[model samples]
Target: MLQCYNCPNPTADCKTAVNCSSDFDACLITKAGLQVYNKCWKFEHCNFNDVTTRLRENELTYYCCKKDLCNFNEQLEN
Candidate 1:
């Protein structure tokens, strides 16, 4: 699993999450842990698209995820 907004430390009540609209492919991640020595993609001005656009907007720190609650992870101590 990937680290979401809530990572390393989280509270029992404090929750973190992410989501996208129906038009959106799904709840995805744009960053997680590192940069530099990574890969890069090129996009044309007239060829602007969703994936390309999002990644570009995020400075190429984008990830792809299509799972249940991809943005949230919580556990309670008993």
Candidate 2:
């Protein structure tokens, strides 16, 4: 099971279970600063890489985990 949060302007929250393709392993993307920009992605194990979304309004940091449903109940970062 995967946690999907493609919510932002239209909506802003996690309220769905996204199915992952056989080609992926981890879920990715999420809120940044204060303005939420819904995002969620999957990576096939090691193929996963971290990315930081930068902008004047906000900055988001993305990461990949190996556990199932590992991207749930997240808030703020260090």
Candidate 3:
């Protein structure tokens, strides 16, 4: 089972870990403004362009990964 970092409206470093179900094969990390969301996501919906279509008006940074705890780090990095 794939384990991912889970958090709800954390300011930073959401270390909470959880096991993903068989259907949810990917880890999702998306940023809207300063808020960060982490959770299990479906592999089929991992497309960045496709996922952002519905929220075209808002500035979003979307990231999807397959490995365990892959979404642990923030998207912006030097």
Candidate 4:
């Protein structure tokens, strides 16, 4: 399971099944209302096989949630 970095109750409060691909966003909010970005990529055993390719091919759009707003690929490197 993917754990939220900013979640207080990572196990119960975090909703990992929320897909952000449609909105061109990727994130989840904790029960406590904390925003967690890249919930899927934070997996312990994340598959890096297509990460670089996907990003380069424009198949995936990265997002960062901050200050209660979704930032879409705003910063190239962070």
Candidate 5:
């Protein structure tokens, strides 16, 4: 069971934690310009693309990790 920061609403500090479901194998941190969102995610989505590098080619980018609480970041780097 992986634990991660869970924030349905974007915030500067999201301290809430959530135990991931079996389907969620990774922690997700989504950054859209300045807003941040955290949640449990599927690993498949993490590897399917590299949008984070090319830059929000999708206007939205995400950081994904498998470790517990990996999504806990005040700010993310590309």
Candidate 6:
């Protein structure tokens, strides 16, 4: 299992949440969380291409944290 780099104590339920401001849509504990955010490089667009790039770039990894853990990835797009 992958652990969060920010949080020392990782839990099975721990996860990073992402929100899409465009439609107020939210995806929780997404299976491809890293890929969606890391590759899309855009908060407005998160599709298969983004996921593919994330895998190719070796940026797909799991993370567990208390707060804003996924924000880092989202910031890339914004």
Give the number of the best model, judged by TM-score: 5
lDDT of each: 0.32, 0.46, 0.71, 0.31, 0.75, 0.31
* Model 6 CA deviation exceeding 4 Å by range: 1-12, 16-29, 32-41, 56-78
Candidate ranking under TM-score, highest first, comes to 5, 3, 2, 1, 6, 4
Q: Write the per-residue lDDT of candidate 6 for residues 1-78, one digit (tens) a residue.
A: 212222122223334433334332222222343333211023333444553464443333332223333434333331
Across 1-78, the per-residue lDDT of candidate 1 in tens digits comes to 222232223233323543333443433333323321111222222122554463344333343344544433221111
Model 6, residue 70: what's the lDDT?
A: 42
lDDT of 5 by residue, 1-78 (tens): 999998867777788999988888988887766767787887776742653542333456677898889997743774
User: How high is each candidate's TM-score?
Assistant: 0.31, 0.47, 0.73, 0.19, 0.75, 0.23
Between which residue pairs do clashes occur in model 2? Answer: 25-43
Off by over 4 Å in 5: 47-58
lDDT of 4 at 3: 25
Can you write out model 4's per-residue Cα lDDT over 1-78, one digit (the tens) per residue? 222233222343333343333323323222212222334332222233343343332223343343223322233233
Task: Evaluate residue 62 in candidate 6 and report its C-alpha lDDT on the 0 to 100 scale.
Answer: 30
Which stretches in model 3 have alpha-carbon errors above 4 Å?
A: 8-11, 48-57
lDDT of 6: 0.31
- Pairs in clash, predicted candidate 4: none
Candidates 3 and 4 compared by lDDT, better number: 3
lDDT for 37 in candidate 3 is 64
lDDT of 3 by residue, 1-78 (tens): 788887745446777898987888888777756666677777787666655663342566778898989986555442
Candidate 4 vs. true structure, TM-score = 0.19
**Residue 5 in model 1: shift from native, Å?**
7.2
